[PDB]
Structure formats: structure tokens, C-alpha cells
Amino acid sequence: GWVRPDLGELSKVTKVKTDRPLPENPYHSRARPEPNPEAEGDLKPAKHGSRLFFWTM
Amino acid sequence: MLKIIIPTTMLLPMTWMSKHNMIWINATVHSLLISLISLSLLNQLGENSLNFSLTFFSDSLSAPLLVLTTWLLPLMLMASQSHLSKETTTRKKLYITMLILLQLFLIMTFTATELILFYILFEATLVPTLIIITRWGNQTERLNAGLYFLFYTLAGSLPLLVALVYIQNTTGSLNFLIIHYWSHPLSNSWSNIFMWLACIMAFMVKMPLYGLHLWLPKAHVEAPIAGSMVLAAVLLKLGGYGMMRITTILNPLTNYMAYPFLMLSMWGMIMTSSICLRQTDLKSLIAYSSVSHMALVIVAIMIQTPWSFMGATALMIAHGLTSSMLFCLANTNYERVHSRTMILARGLQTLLPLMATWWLVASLTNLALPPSINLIGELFIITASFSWSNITIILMGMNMMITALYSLYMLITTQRGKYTHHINNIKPSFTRENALMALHILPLLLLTLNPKMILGPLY
Numbered sequence: 389g390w391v392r393p394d395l396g397e398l399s400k401v402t403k404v405k406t407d408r409p410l411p412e413n414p415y416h417s418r419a420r421p422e423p424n425p426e427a428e429g430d431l432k433p434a435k436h437g438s439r440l441f442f443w444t445m
Numbered sequence: 446m447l448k449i450i451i452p453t454t455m456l457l458p459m460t461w462m463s464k465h466n467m468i469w470i471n472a473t474v475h476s477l478l479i480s481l482i483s484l485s486l487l488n489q490l491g492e493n494s495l496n497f498s499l500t501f502f503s504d505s506l507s508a509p510l511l512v513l514t515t516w517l518l519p520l521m522l523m524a525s526q527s528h529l530s531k532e533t534t535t536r537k538k539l540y541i542t543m544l545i546l547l548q549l550f551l552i553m554t555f556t557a558t559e560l561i562l563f564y565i566l567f568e569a570t571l572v573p574t575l576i577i578i579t580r581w582g583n584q585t586e587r588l589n590a591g592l593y594f595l596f597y598t599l600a601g602s603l604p605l606l607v608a609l610v611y612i613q614n615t616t617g618s619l620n621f622l623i624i625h626y627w628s629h630p631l632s633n634s635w636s637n638i639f640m641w642l643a644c645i646m647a648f649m650v651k652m653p654l655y656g657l658h659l660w661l662p663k664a665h666v667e668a669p670i671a672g673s674m675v676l677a678a679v680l681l682k683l684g685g686y687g688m689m690r691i692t693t694i695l696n697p698l699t700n701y702m703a704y705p706f707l708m709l710s711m712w713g714m715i716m717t718s719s720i721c722l723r724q725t726d727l728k729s730l731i732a733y734s735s736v737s738h739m740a741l742v743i744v745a746i747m748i749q750t751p752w753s754f755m756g757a758t759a760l761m762i763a764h765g766l767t768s769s770m771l772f773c774l775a776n777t778n779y780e781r782v783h784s785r786t787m788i789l790a791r792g793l794q795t796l797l798p799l800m801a802t803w804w805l806v807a808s809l810t811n812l813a814l815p816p817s818i819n820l821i822g823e824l825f826i827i828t829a830s831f832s833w834s835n836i837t838i839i840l841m842g843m844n845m846m847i848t849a850l851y852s853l854y855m856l857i858t859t860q861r862g863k864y865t866h867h868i869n870n871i872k873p874s875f876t877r878e879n880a881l882m883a884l885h886i887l888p889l890l891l892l893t894l895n896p897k898m899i900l901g902p903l904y
């Protein structure tokens with residue numbers, strides 16, 4: 389009493405009910421290095437202008 | 446200061462929109478007016494300075510040089526009025542533009558509270574001078590003279606830029622006030638020795654020091670009259686002013702790094718004074734006299750004592766005025782003679798008596814006669830060098846004797862004796878030349894009444 393699968397049936401994506409725990413870190417990766425401080429604030433005019441040689445502005 | 450810089454700038458549009466036959470009148474009148482405005486700067490105080498703003502400041506060292514610079518331009522215009530008669534309007538306006546640009550650059554240079562701005566204008570003063578020398582020059586050697594004048598200066602002054610930016614990187618500021626207040630001793634090291642050499646050589650080449658003076662006779666001989674006076678009067682003082690400004694950070698290295706330059710100057714004064722005796726040319730003789738006087742100023746600055754600085758400033762102003770007068774007189778002679786040779790025209794005192802009087806007065810002032818400021822600066826430097834070492838008096842006295850000898854030789858060869866027979870175009874002296882000589886000489890005899898105005902900040 390076996391029914392041959394039709395076209396487009398064996399290529400379906402299916403779901404599997406298993407009791408095996410999901411691996412938490414399969415890549416065996418290390419700890420990611422800390423990112424840069426990426427500081428924030430409100431911009432203020434440059435102190436005493438450009439300060440390039442004799443230029444006062 | 447802008448009350449001085451702005452009118453000098455406005456002189457350019459004033460000249461360029463003037464009528465074709467009224468440029469000289471307007472330029473002379475407004476240059477004289479500008480000089481009157483510059484007179485206010487002379488009232489210095491015993492305290493720090495007249496700090497006008499963040500960019501310009503005036504001291505009692507900058508005030509006399511600024512007044513002389515502003516005063517020279519009318520005289521340059523009156524001197525150039527003669528040989529530019531047959532020149533097109535555009536070229537005459539370009540000549541006046543070059544003179545005005547030179548004055549503006551010098552005015553901005555002498556205050557220049559920051560050293561990099563000072564250097565920028567100190568090299569900017571080189572383009573109008575080169576254009577004047579190589580364009581409106583008579584002889585065919587003006588090109589070589591211009592090349593020598595450009596390269597001798599630039600080769601010396603190029604390491605100065607590197608030294609200045611290095612100092613800014615380490616010290617953190619190049620403002621002269623901060624530089625003076627935060628000065629620290631220079632340790633005895635090879636790096637500090639080369640910093641000293643870089644900071645000093647740029648100003649010693651322009652003074653000029655003996656051994657690097659080859660550009661000066663060429664530049665003075667081949668240049669037109671106005672270029673000659675602006676070279677002998679103001680452009681030579683740039684090196685000394687810079688050296689007296691910058692020696693504030695080179696201590697105590699100078700205490701033993703001054704020996705080669707002191708020896709070179711104290712021997713080159715004698716050498717050039719002797720050279721003046723055997724000279725076939727007038728302008729060359731005056732140029733070598735300028736070299737001798739500037740060598741004396743170099744000695745004074747390198748001694749680094751208050752009397753040295755006072756004498757150096759007095760000698761700077763006096764030599765500027767005297768050399769300008771002598772070049773004026775030589776040019777007036779050359780215009781009639783068209784030869785520029787000392788012994789070709791003789792006995793001119795019989796034909797031109799008042800010009801003989803002007804020659805006598807100029808020679809006496811150059812001879813360092815008391816109580817003129819020439820001798821004031823001379824004697825101050827002599828006493829300071831005597832304090833430095835008792836043996837310098839021999840060299841200084843020899844220089845004084847040779848100076849008197851060549852000054853009176855210049856007077857006698859051209860004024861006394863029997864007139865040359867085959868010259869019959871010695872026209873009577875114009876009013877312009879007499880007025881030029883009077884305006885050259887009267888400020889000297891007036892400044893001898895108030896010496897404190899030209900004795901510098903260490904008065």
C-alpha cells in the first residue's frame with residue numbers, strides 16, 4: 389500500500405520534531421572585541437578658531 | 446595699526462585712476478601724508494609695547510624703522526621722477542605700484558607679532574625688489590645681479606622656515622610675547638647648534654655678513670636709484686631686526702656660537718673699509734661702506750648687551766639715512782655724466798657749489814662726526830665691545846681711521862681739483878635734487894636733538 393510521491397513533493401522543505409538541544413555556538417567562535425566608544429554630544433564652535441599659525445579665524 | 450596699512454593699500458587705486466600727468470604729484474603728497482600718520486607710533490612707553498591687536502604690535506624698536514620706511518617713499522618717488530620721463534604711463538604706474546607694494550610689505554613685516562607671518566612678509570619683500578632691479582635697470586648685468594640677490598637670500602632663509610615650524614611644534618606658539626615670556630635655555634647639543642645656525646643664518650645673509658656679501662655690490666650697482674635707496678636704507682635692516690627679535694630663544698648657546706660671526710664681522714669691517722679706498726666706482730664704494738657699517742651692527746647684536754642694542758638701533762637708522770643720501774648724490778652725478786666713474790668727472794665744486802655742500806655734509810655724517818647719531822651708535826657699540834674684550838678697540842679704531850680716509854677720498858676726488866675739460870653738459874642743479882638732499886639730511890640733524898627716539902627698547 390505504498391503511494392509513489394508526485395512531482396514537486398520530495399523537494400519540499402519540511403519541519404522536524406526532535407529532542408536534540410539546539411547548539412548554542414556551533415562555530416566555536418571567541419568573544420567579539422569591544423566596539424569603539426562612539427562618543428556623542430552637541431557641537432560647539434572651535435576654540436579660538438583654526439589655531440593655524442597666525443590665523444585668528 | 447590699520448590706520449597705516451589701509452591708506453598704503455588705498456595708494457594703489459589712487460595711483461591707477463590718476464591722470465597721466467599727475468601721478469607723481471598725488472603719490473608724493475599722499476606718501477608724505479602717510480608719514481605724518483606714522484609719527485604717532487613713536488610715542489612708546491617704558492612698559493611692554495603698543496599691542497594693537499592679535500596680529501600687529503609696535504615696540505620702540507619697530508617705531509623708528511616704521512617711520513623711516515614710511516618717510517623713504519616720497520624720496521624714492523622724487524628720485525625716480527628723473528629717469529622715468531620717457532616712460533609710458535602704464536609702466537610708470539607699475540613702477541609706483543611696485544614701490545607701494547614694497548612699502549606695504551615692509552610695514553606689515555616690522556610689526557608681525559607672530560614669527561611665521563614675519564617670515565612670510567620677510568620673503569614677500571623679495572619679489573617687488575627683484576622686479577624693480579631686473580626691469581628698470583640700465584646695465585646688462587642687472588639679470589645676474591637679480592639672480593644673485595634672489596638666491597643668496599633664499600638659500601639662507603629656507604632652513605629658517607623649517608626651524609620655525611619645528612619651534613612651533615615643540616614650544617607650541619610662535620607669538621613673540623609668548624616666546625619671550627616662556628623662553629627656556631638651549632642645551633649644548635648638536636641639534637641645538639644646528640637650530641641656532643638655521644635661525645641665525647637667514648638673517649646674517651641679508652645683513653650681510655662678510656663672506657656672504659657678494660650679492661650686495663651687484664644689487665646696489667645694477668639697480669635703479671629707488672631700488673638702491675630701498676636696499677641700502679630699509680632692506681638691510683630686516684636682517685638685524687630679525688636677529689634682535691630672535692636672539693631671545695638662542696641663549697645661552699650664543700655665548701660661544703657667536704665667535705665665528707664675531708671674528709668674521711670684526712675682520713670684514715677692516716677688509717671692506719680697505720676695499721673702499723681702491724675703488725673705480727662710486728656706487729660700489731657706497732655699497733662696500735654699507736657692508737662695513739652692517740658688519741659693525743652684526744658685532745653689536747652678537748655682543749648682546751643693552752648698550753650694544755641701543756647703539757645697533759641708532760646705527761641702523763643713521764646708516765639708512767646716510768646711505769640713501771649718498772646714493773642720491775651719486776645718481777645726480779651719473780645723470781649728467783652718464784658714465785658712473787669716480788675720476789671721469791672732477792672739480793664739480795667749482796660748477797655746482799650747493800651740491801658740493803651736500804656732498805660735504807653727507808661725507809661728514811658718514812665719517813661719524815659728533816654729535817650726529819652716526820657717532821652715537823658707533824660709540825655705544827665701541828664701548829660695549831670694549832667691555833666684551835679690551836682688544837677690540839684696535840680693530841674698531843682701524844676701521845674708524847679707514848672710514849675717514851675713504852669718505853674724504855670720495856669727497857676730494859669728485860669735488861676738489863681742476864674740472865675735466867671735455868665735459869660741457871653739467872647743467873645747474875635742479876630744485877628737485879636740492880630738495881631731495883635737504884629732506885635727506887634735515888631729519889638726521891633733527892634726530893641728533895632727541896636721541897631717545899631711536900635708541901631702542903633698552904633705553
Ligand SMILES: CCCCCCCCCCCCCCCCC[C@@H](O)O[C@H](CO[C@H](O)CCCCCCCCCCCCCCC)COP(=O)(O)OCC[N+](C)(C)C
Nearest residue numbers: 446447448449477478479480481482483484485486487488
Ligand atoms: C601751537 C601748537 C604747536 C603744536 C602743534 C602740534 C600739531 C600736531 C599735528 C600733527 C599730528 C601728527 C599726526 C598724528 C596721528 C596719530 C594720531 C591719530 O592716529 O589719531 C587719530 C585722530 O586723528 C585726528 O582726528 C586727525 C588728525 C589728522 C590731521 C593732523 C593735523 C594736521 C593735518 C594736516 C593735513 C593737511 C592740512 C591741509 C593742507 C592743504 C585717531 O584717534 P583715535 O584712535 O580715535 O583716539 C582714541 C583716543 N581718544 C578717544 C581719546 C581720541
Ligand SMILES: CCCCCCCCCCCCCCCCC[C@@H](O)O[C@H](CO[C@H](O)CCCCCCCCCCCCCCC)COP(=O)(O)OCC[N+](C)(C)C
Nearest residue numbers: 632633634635636638642646654655656657702705706709
Ligand atoms: C664662508 C663664509 C661664512 C659662512 C658662515 C660661517 C659660520 C659657520 C661655522 C659654524 C660655527 C661652529 C660649528 C660647530 C661649533 C661647535 C664647537 C666645535 O666645533 O668644537 C669642537 C667639536 O669638535 C669638532 O669640531 C667636531 C666637528 C667637526 C666637523 C665639523 C666641520 C669642521 C670644518 C668644516 C668647515 C666648513 C664651514 C662652511 C660649510 C659650507 C669641540 O668638541 P666637543 O666639546 O667634544 O663638542 C662640543 C659640542 N657638544 C658639546 C654639543 C658635544
Ligand SMILES: CCCCCCCC/C=C\CCCCCCCC(=O)O[C@H](COC(=O)CCCCCCC/C=C/CCCCCCCC)COP(=O)(O)OCCN
Nearest residue numbers: 597600601604607608611636637639640642643646650657
Ligand atoms: C648663503 C648660503 C648660506 C647657506 C645656509 C645653510 C646652512 C644653515 C644651517 C643648517 C640648515 C639646516 C638645519 C636644520 C633646520 C633646524 C631644525 C632643527 O633644529 O631640528 C634638529 C634637527 O637637526 C638636523 O636635522 C640638522 C641636519 C642638517 C642636514 C642639512 C645639512 C646642511 C649643511 C650643514 C652644514 C652647514 C653649516 C654651515 C653653513 C654656513 C653657510 C654656508 C633637531 O633634530 P630632532 O629630530 O628634533 O632630534 C631630537 C632628538 N634627539
